[PDB]
Amino acid sequence: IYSRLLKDRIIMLGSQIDDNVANSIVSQLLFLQAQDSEKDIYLYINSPGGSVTAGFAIYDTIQHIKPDVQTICIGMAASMGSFLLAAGAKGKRFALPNAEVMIHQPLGATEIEIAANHILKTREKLNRILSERTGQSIEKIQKDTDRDNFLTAEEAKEYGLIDEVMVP
Amino acid sequence: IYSRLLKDRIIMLGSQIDDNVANSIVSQLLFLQAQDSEKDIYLYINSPGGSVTAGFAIYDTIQHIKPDVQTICIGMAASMGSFLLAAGAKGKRFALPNAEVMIHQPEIEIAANHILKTREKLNRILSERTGQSIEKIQKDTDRDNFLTAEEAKEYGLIDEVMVPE
Amino acid sequence: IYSRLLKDRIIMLGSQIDDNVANSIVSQLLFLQAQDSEKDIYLYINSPGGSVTAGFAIYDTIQHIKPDVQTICIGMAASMGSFLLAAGAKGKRFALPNAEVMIHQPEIEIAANHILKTREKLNRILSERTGQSIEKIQKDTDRDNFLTAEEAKEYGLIDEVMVPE
Amino acid sequence: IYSRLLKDRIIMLGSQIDDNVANSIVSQLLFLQAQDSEKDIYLYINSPGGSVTAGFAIYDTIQHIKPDVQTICIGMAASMGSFLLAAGAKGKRFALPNAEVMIHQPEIEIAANHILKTREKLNRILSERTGQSIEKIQKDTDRDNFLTAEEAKEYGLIDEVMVPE
Amino acid sequence: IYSRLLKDRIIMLGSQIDDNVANSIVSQLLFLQAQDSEKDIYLYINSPGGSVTAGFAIYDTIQHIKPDVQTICIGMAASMGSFLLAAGAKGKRFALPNAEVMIHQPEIEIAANHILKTREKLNRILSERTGQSIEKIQKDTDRDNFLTAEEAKEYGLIDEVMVPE
Amino acid sequence: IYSRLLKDRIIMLGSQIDDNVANSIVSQLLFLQAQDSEKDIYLYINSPGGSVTAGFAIYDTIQHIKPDVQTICIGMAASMGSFLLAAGAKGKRFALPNAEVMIHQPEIEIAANHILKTREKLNRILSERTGQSIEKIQKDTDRDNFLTAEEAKEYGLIDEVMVPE
Amino acid sequence: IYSRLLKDRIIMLGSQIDDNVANSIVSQLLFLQAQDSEKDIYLYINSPGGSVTAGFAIYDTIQHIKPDVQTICIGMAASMGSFLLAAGAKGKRFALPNAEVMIHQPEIEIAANHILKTREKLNRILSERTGQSIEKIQKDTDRDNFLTAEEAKEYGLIDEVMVP
Amino acid sequence: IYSRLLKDRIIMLGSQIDDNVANSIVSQLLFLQAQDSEKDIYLYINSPGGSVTAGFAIYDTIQHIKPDVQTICIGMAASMGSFLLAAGAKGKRFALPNAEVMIHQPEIEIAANHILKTREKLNRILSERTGQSIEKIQKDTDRDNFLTAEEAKEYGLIDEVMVPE
Amino acid sequence: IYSRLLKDRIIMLGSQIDDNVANSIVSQLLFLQAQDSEKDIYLYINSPGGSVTAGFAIYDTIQHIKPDVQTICIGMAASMGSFLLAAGAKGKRFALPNAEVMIHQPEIEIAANHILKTREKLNRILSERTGQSIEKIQKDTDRDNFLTAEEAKEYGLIDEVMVPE
Amino acid sequence: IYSRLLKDRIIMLGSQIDDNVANSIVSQLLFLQAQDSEKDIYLYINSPGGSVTAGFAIYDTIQHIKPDVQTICIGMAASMGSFLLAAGAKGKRFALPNAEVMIHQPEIEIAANHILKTREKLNRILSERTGQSIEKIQKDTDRDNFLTAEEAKEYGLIDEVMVPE
Amino acid sequence: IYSRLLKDRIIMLGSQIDDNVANSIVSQLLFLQAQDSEKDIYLYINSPGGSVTAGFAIYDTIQHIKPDVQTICIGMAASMGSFLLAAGAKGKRFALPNAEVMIHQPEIEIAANHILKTREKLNRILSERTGQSIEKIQKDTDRDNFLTAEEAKEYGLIDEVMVPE
Amino acid sequence: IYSRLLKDRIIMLGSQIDDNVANSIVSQLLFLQAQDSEKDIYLYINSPGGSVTAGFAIYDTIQHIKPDVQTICIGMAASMGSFLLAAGAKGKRFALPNAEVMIHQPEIEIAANHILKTREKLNRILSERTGQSIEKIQKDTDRDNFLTAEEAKEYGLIDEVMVPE
């Protein structure tokens, strides 16, 4: 059922992000480029978020591929999911009227897990990448990513997450 | 089994709405759009209701897709369930004669707003599609009350109670 | 295993009726309509009975679908179970010789009404399909009594007790 | 594992009879009818016995299906277990040499009748299929007695004790 | 895990024999018959022993199936365990060198007979398959004695003690 | 979790040996034979020791299977535990450097023999596989003594103490 | 729950060490070897300490497996607990800043030897991996003393106290 | 704790009536008789009700002892609970104002009689002590109905509803 | 609590009879003999019944002591319970009006005798004290039947049903 | 532990009210009456609330005993919990400053009455002891609302909020 | 309670014999010697039997004390229980009519001797006091057999079966 | 009970020796010295043995008191139990004929010494009082061996095995 969608180059990120899900989408991202490098990819996102490392793997492949990947936020986008929303092609990042976006990044388990992310400083990268595309200063990013809050669709547009709010 | 129904453009919504179901619904809607963007989509509803955020993802995608989506309530539809019933394409939102419809509710500086602000966004979107005045909707979604099929018609949730044939 | 029966248009109702089963029934009915909207549907029933709201969803969908649905009781059918037996397509509602049939029951300003109002809606819909007068039905669904296959025929639940062949 | 036996039209009845098992039996019988309505069905029986109502649902469906059903007792068969043994298609009801067979029993104005009336309906249906006179059956199902394979043959439960080959 | 052994026609009997195990054995035997009715069945035995009636159901089904069943004792086999060992297909009943074999026992007008009559039926069926005279078997099953693999061969329980290779 | 090791032909023996474990070991051995009858089987051992009869069933099956079984002691191995260590395929029986090995013991006309006769059968089978003379083994299994890995090599239990790499 | 950590090659050692735990550890180590014999294994340690013999089975298997095993102490590690900490793959043996480390002890012709001989085998194997001289180790494992993370580094138990 | 009440001739009946409680009651009654055979015994009752046979043992011993026994209902008293309330010494049987009282029910040739015959013996013994006519009692103990303290007085269960002071 | 009754020469028998109770009874009987060897002993009985051997120890000691022992049944007395009731000192064996009385039952060369021989010794000792003929007793202790107080008097178990006073 | 408090005439009510607790409360009240019928009883209350019938048994016994009972709320008191708070001896019913108080709710011909009739009996008995008019009480017990200590004083539940000292 | 019997020189042996009981017996024997070294000691016995070593301590002390000790069996006496019965002072060892008597049994170089040597010391000491020849005793203590009171007299365990008076 | 024996200067040592018992012994010894410092003290011993340190406190106090202390073994005396037997006043240390006697055993720089040094102090103090040479005692206390009364006499533990009289 995803396949017939895959044939139209529509990819769905629908759940918590783990390596299994990441691997699947990366496989789908490559598969679409092999089908055509020119045509757009529709990436629909409803996720709470998930593992940070698996996020980059999805992020990098979206960056590495030639095709334009649009992101469209449906439902709730949070953690890595929200991160992949702002990571879409510029001008192509949309959200439906009612979606809620939370850019908070949870710290998480064993510290060693922390050992790499802090070592990873993904937040810095996460803050760095998010700051560049959203246009906000790194400091402001650092603060919000540390806080629990929920932006509406519109509030995510002014803040720089989504370029548009799609009307019915 | 569901595919054979899906091939005929019927979508069953059968249980409390979580991220798993909502996703599975959304994917089917975008599917049935990719199949044929003209013929309408029959969406049955029997639910106790479900998580709010997972509800909108079904709501918005109903609006965002081109085809008409006929919500047909059967049996209980409550909480975010009915809110999908009332979200159907106008004129096509049905119920079966014996079914019942019902409506109700599911750092603190921020959390207290998010719980309130989330509810008005339900109170509004029902005020359009029922046509009732918010001062009534504001009151109804608060208190639990059981609307029979007919009393829902008068209320503005369902347009036509489907009579057997 | 069930599919192979489903392919032959037989639907087993095997246990107390919850949202899980009722859904699985409904989906199969709308299925067997999508397959062929002419040939009748054999619906077996063996149940202790189940939740009310989940029962209607099976009831209404029997009415709402085009084909005829032959309810065949085997073994005990009680509470909302029999109420589906008596809901079959007229003339086709059967029982096997040794089976038994039985019928009975499952803020306070609102709750007291909803419990009463829900029951009349059972008392009515049995009054049509048994043909008995509500003053009798009003009394029967209250007290527990065990109707053999034959005594059900006389009573109006089942039309034809199926004799072995 | 059972399917591979089911594909060869063998049905194991392995434990005390509840609604879960009885259903699973019934579904398999109606299945093996849908597969082939000619070839007979081998039904093995090893049981301590089970709930009465769940027994009939196996009994009636044996009668209601077209094919012949060969009940083969192995090991103990007692209470509602044997009553299925004696319910097999005449001439085919077997036992293995060493197996044992046994027979026995499991508002008050109504309850006292239902407990009595349910038992005669066992006393009758054994009187046909054993051929014994009810005045004997009336007595046997009351007292616990252990019938060896042979003594069952003389008694009329099993037609042919299967000798090893 | 067991299936992969079952696919190779090996059946482990691992614990005291109840209705649950005996059933699971029987179903596997009738299975391995349905697979291939020619190739023999390896049946390992390690048991303290089990319920009598559940034992026969394994015994009779060994006799009733067509293929040869090679009982291979490993470790202790006692009470109804050995009685299955001695029930293997003649010439194929084995033991491993260090294993041990042992044999022994588990209204009153009726109960006193059933306890006696059940035991002779063990005393007989061992008298055939060991070849010993009942006056000896009558005595052995009474008293507890530990037969090594070899002493079992001399005794007639096992034909060939399997030597390692 | 164990399966993934089992797939690589490793078998953990982790606790005192009862019928439950011994069975689970045996089934795995006959399994790994059915998979591949060539490649050797790694059998780790960490045990305080266990029931005698349940030990042999592991012993005999090691002998009875075709593949080589490498017993690798880690941590304490005592009583019937070591007796499996010393039962490995010759030349492959290992230990890790720091592990310890130890050996010792667990109508009256009959019982006094069975307790003695069971022990010689341990004294013998260690006399082969250690190579020591029974007059020494007869003495060692009586008194409790703690053999380090090396002192076991000199003793004949383990062939090669595995050094880290 | 642990599997999901196990899939990422982390092994929690959470309580006093008995045969049940030690076995469960060993099986996981041989597992993570069967999965991938290259990538190192993170082994966390929080323990009051446990039975001696069950400790070695964890020790030896750390040595016997190919991959590197990084022992990370968190919270108290004492008795046979620390002895696993000090048994990690050299250079990778860590501690968190606030954790504490500690070391100490648990026919008569034979029994008196086995209790002594078992302890030297602890005194030796710590003398290699701490680098301290046995005459010091011989003394330390006798008396109870609480080594903070840093004082353990100086002592030779842990190589690098992990800073947040 | 209870003894100090027992010393003052108060007996609490606190839970469903089993053999354990009934015994403990009986022993206390015969006790309080042995202490003083003149002064009356206060017997409180709060019960959902209990086993029939264990009830009589409390009933009969109330009759068999010399002193007067004042049954004081507090909270629910139902099934065999009330039947003790109505069994108090005439004129002294009380209730507190808000308490509720209720009455209802708990080989086949013999069993069907014993279940009927046991109930009449309740229907009779209530007919004396309530004074109502059996044709009414015969009907009341069948159907579940909730008698408030006062409505019990009118009914004849309790003589004097105790008003607070 | 019991002592105060014991001081008044009352002995409660309250539960199924095990070695613990029987001992506690015996010790009390020999006690009440040591106190006063003249005044009779009141022995109440409410029991489901108990182990046979532990029953005799109460029986024999009733016979062996000098004083008269008045067995007073209250509530159910069955199995070895009634057998103590019928064992009271002749003329003093009572029952209360509503109580019920009932009677029934609880190497193989030896075991089959011991189970039979133990029962006749009950059949005999009831034949004396009821006065009934063994051919009747032989039949009664086999089948379960519920004797009311009066029907026991006619039967010979109890001499005088105690009427309330 | 509680006894030492009980000796000082303090009674803790600590959890949701079932038959077990209510009984344990009642027994303690009748106890503290038997100790001294003059000195008042301190009754603390911290509860989420409990079963209705088990509540009255605490209510009535407060009224029925002679001494004054000072209800002291601490922490949440809700449902039948507060209804005991408001049931204290007038003038002594307290609360601590930070505690919260709250009030709300827990054949069909009969059942619908019993659920209604049971609630008025709560609505009444609060109308006396709060002094509020039933038309207000009728409304308050329906909707959930959180009354702080003070707002309860104004409301009439508690007389004096106890200030720390 | 026991003291009052002890004051009359009766000693109850009521349960399986452990160190706790045996001690309590011994202390009582040496006591009753210190009281009066002339009058005989009544020792009742009802036991399933107990630990061997704890038995002798009762045996030897019977011999070592001056007074005569009359063992009176009541109910079952088995294993080390009877061995005390047969250890009474000659001529005084009794039984009650219905009681039953029975006799049977409870490093390896040493352990095998200690288990044998301990038993002969029972076989001997019964050979004196029964008078039977060891070749018979050697056989009897091995096999379980139930000796009635009389058959014990003939056997030499008890001198006089006490008849009721 | 013990006092009455204590008054006659008998002291029972009945169980494994802990601080509680040892204290209770010591206090009694110093007592019986305070009573009369001339007459000897009978000390019975039946023990499995006990804690070492608690043993000496009994040993030393035997030596430290003036009177002679006659240790009389009855039944098993082992571990620190016998070591008290052998500690009696020379010439008076007895045993009863059937009793058995046995002897055996119960920072590391310090702990290894304390366990060794504590044992020699047992090996010595037995070497005096048995008279055996330490090279024998050194060996005996190591291995478990069961000394009958006589074999103890030859060994030097007991002087005179007391024969019955």
Q: Which of K1, K96, K164 sits opposite I27 (nearest CB)?
A: K1
Burial of G146 (0-12, 13-18, 19+ CB in 10 A): exposed
- Give the residue on B whose Cα is nearest the Cα of A149: B110
Amino acid at L157: L
Pick from I30, I32, I123 the residue to mutate for testing the K interface (most K CBs within 10 Å).
Answer: I30
Which residue's structure tokens are 């009444």? J124
Q: Tokens in use for A125?
A: 């990268």
CA-to-CA distance for C156 and C83, rounded, in angstroms?
Answer: 12
Give the domain range for residue D80.
1-165
Q: Which of J108, J119, J142 sits opposite C116 (nearest CB)?
A: J108
Q: How many CB atoms lie within 10 A of CB L154?
A: 10
CA-to-CA distance for J89 and J145, rounded, in angstroms?
Answer: 25
* F46–G30 C-beta distance less than 8 A: no
CA-to-CA distance for B76 and B48, rounded, in angstroms?
Answer: 7
Q: Are C78 and C60 in contact (CB under 8 A)?
A: no
Paired residues of B77 in beta bridges: B47, B101
- Give the residue on B whose Cα is nearest the Cα of A147: B107
- Give the residue on E whose Cα is nearest the Cα of I142: E107
Paired residues of H42 in beta bridges: H10, H70
CA-to-CA distance for L152 and L165, rounded, in angstroms?
Answer: 21
Q: Which of C31, C34, C60 sits opposite B98 (nearest CB)?
A: C60
- Give the residue on L whose Cα is nearest the Cα of G105: L107
Q: Tokens in use for F113?
A: 């023999």
| Method by which this entry was solved | cryo-EM
Resolution (A): 3.7
- Collect all residues of chain E within an 8 Å Cβ-Cβ radius of residue F121: 98
- Nearest chain I CA: its distance from K151 CA (Å): 13
Q: How many CB atoms lie within 10 A of CB B66?
A: 8
- E104 tagged catalytic: yes
- Nearest chain B CA: its distance from C98 CA (Å): 32
* G72–A111 C-beta distance less than 8 A: yes
Furthest CA-CA distance within chain E: 56
Q: Could you give the residue ranges of the DSSP H alpha helices within G10-79?
A: 19-35, 52-64
CA-to-CA distance for D45 and D92, rounded, in angstroms?
Answer: 13
Q: Are J11 and J25 in contact (CB under 8 A)?
A: yes
Cα B75 → chain centroid = 13
- Collect all residues of chain J within an 8 Å Cβ-Cβ radius of residue H164: 63-64
Q: Tokens in use for D55?
A: 């027994």
Pick from I43, I96, I163 the residue to mutate for testing the H interface (most H CBs within 10 Å).
Answer: I96
* L112–G115 C-beta distance less than 8 A: yes
Q: Which of F10, F97, F145 sits opposite G30 (nearest CB)?
A: F10
Q: Which of I27, I54, I117 sits opposite K12 (nearest CB)?
A: I27
CA angle G47, G50, G52 (to 5 degrees): 140
Provide the CB-side half-sphere exposure for B57 (13 A, CA).
34
DSSP code string of I56-67: HHHHHHHHHSSS
Q: H75 in helix, strand or coil? A: strand
CA-to-CA distance for F130 and F137, rounded, in angstroms?
Answer: 9
- Per DSSP bridges, beta strands D160-161 and K69-77 are unpaired
- Nearest chain C CA: its distance from D146 CA (Å): 27
Q: Which chains lie within 8 Å of chain H at 3 or more CB pairs, if any?
A: D, I, J
- Give the residue on G whose Cα is nearest the Cα of F48: G19
Q: H66 in helix, strand or coil? A: coil
Paired residues of H162 in beta bridges: none
CA-to-CA distance for H52 and H56, rounded, in angstroms?
Answer: 7
Q: Which chains lie within 8 Å of chain B at 3 or more CB pairs, if any?
A: A, C
- Collect all residues of chain F within an 8 Å Cβ-Cβ radius of residue G114: 146
- Give the residue on B whose Cα is nearest the Cα of A7: B34
Q: Are C96 and C158 in contact (CB under 8 A)?
A: no
Q: Tokens in use for F72?
A: 């690798």
Q: Tokens in use for C82?
A: 């029999």
DSSP code string of A114-156: HHHHHHHTHHHHHHHHHHHHH---HHHHHHHHTS---B-HHHH
- Collect all residues of chain K within an 8 Å Cβ-Cβ radius of residue I110: 144-146
CA-to-CA distance for E27 and E17, rounded, in angstroms?
Answer: 15
Write a three-state SS string for L5-44: HHHCCEEEECCCCCHHHHHHHHHHHHHHHHHCCCCCEEEE
CA-to-CA distance for F47 and F91, rounded, in angstroms?
Answer: 21
Which residues of D fall below an 8 Å CB-CB distance to E? 1-2, 4-5, 7-8, 10, 12, 14-15, 44, 46, 48, 74-76, 96-100, 144-146, 162, 164-165
Q: Could you give the residue ranges of the DSSP H alpha helices within K50-107?
A: 52-64, 80-85
Closest residue by Cα to residue D149 from D159, D164, D139: D159
- Collect all residues of chain I within an 8 Å Cβ-Cβ radius of residue K164: 63-64
Q: Say which DSSP state H20 is in.
A: H
Q: What does the buried/exposed string (b/e) look like for G65-81 if buried means 16 or more CB atoms within 10 Å of the residue's CB?
A: bebbbbbbbbebbbbbb
Domain count of the fold of chain J: 1
Q: Which of J54, J107, J121 sits opposite H75 (nearest CB)?
A: J54
- Collect all residues of chain F within an 8 Å Cβ-Cβ radius of residue E44: 26, 30
Closest residue by Cα to residue E86 from E146, E131, E133: E131
- Alpha carbon dihedral K128, K129, K133, K138, in 10-degree steps, equals -100
Q: Are I41 and I68 in contact (CB under 8 A)?
A: yes
Q: Are I27 and K1 in contact (CB under 8 A)?
A: yes
Q: For residue G144, give the CATH number of its domain.
A: 3.90.226.10
Paired residues of I102 in beta bridges: I146
CA-to-CA distance for E37 and E66, rounded, in angstroms?
Answer: 6
Q: How many CB atoms lie within 10 A of CB A71?
A: 27
Q: Do chains B and G touch (3 or more CB pairs under 8 A)?
A: no
**Which residues, including other chains, have CB under 8 Å from residue B33's CB and lie 6 or more apart?**
B65, B66, B67
- Collect all residues of chain C within an 8 Å Cβ-Cβ radius of residue B15: 19-20, 23
- Alpha carbon dihedral I67, I68, I72, I73, in 10-degree steps, equals 90
- Nearest chain G CA: its distance from L136 CA (Å): 14
CA-to-CA distance for I31 and I2, rounded, in angstroms?
Answer: 14
Q: Which of C22, C31, C121 sits opposite B5 (nearest CB)?
A: C31
Q: C153 in helix, strand or coil? A: helix
CA-to-CA distance for H139 and H111, rounded, in angstroms?
Answer: 22
**Which residues, including other chains, have CB under 8 Å from residue D66's CB and lie 6 or more apart?**
C165, D33, D37, D38
* A113–G96 C-beta distance less than 8 A: no
Closest residue by Cα to residue E96 from E152, E144, E146: E152
DSSP code string of chain D: -HHHHHHTTEEEE-S---HHHHHHHHHHHHHHHHH-SSS-EEEEEEES---HHHHHHHHHHHHHSSS-EEEEEEEEE-THHHHHHTTSPTT--EE-TT-EEE-----HHHHHHHHHHHHHHHHHHHHHHH---HHHHHHHTTS--EEEHHHHHHHTS-SEEPPP-
* G26–F44 C-beta distance less than 8 A: yes
CA-to-CA distance for I146 and I102, rounded, in angstroms?
Answer: 5
* C119–J115 C-beta distance less than 8 A: no
DSSP code string of G72-118: EEEEEE-THHHHHHTTSPTT--EE-TT-EEE-----HHHHHHHHHHH
Q: Tokens in use for E100?
A: 């041990």
- Per DSSP bridges, beta strands A41-47 and A94-95 are unpaired
- Collect all residues of chain B within an 8 Å Cβ-Cβ radius of residue A5: 27, 30-31, 34
Burial of D76 (0-12, 13-18, 19+ CB in 10 A): buried
Q: Which of G20, G30, G64 sits opposite F96 (nearest CB)?
A: G64
Q: Are F67 and F35 in contact (CB under 8 A)?
A: no
Which residues of H fall below an 8 Å CB-CB distance to D? 105, 107-109, 111-112, 115-116, 119, 142
Instruction: Tell which residues of chain I come right before a gap with C–N over 2.5 A.
Output: 106
Which residue's structure tokens are 């038994």? C100
Which residues of C fall below an 8 Å CB-CB distance to J? 105, 107-109, 111-112, 115-116, 119, 142
**Which residues, including other chains, have CB under 8 Å from residue L5's CB and lie 6 or more apart?**
K27, K30, K31, K34, L11, L12
Q: Do chains A and E touch (3 or more CB pairs under 8 A)?
A: no
Paired residues of E146 in beta bridges: E102
Q: Is the dihedral of CA I141, I145, I150, I151 positive or negative?
A: negative
CA-to-CA distance for L25 and L55, rounded, in angstroms?
Answer: 10
- Collect all residues of chain B within an 8 Å Cβ-Cβ radius of residue A44: 26, 30
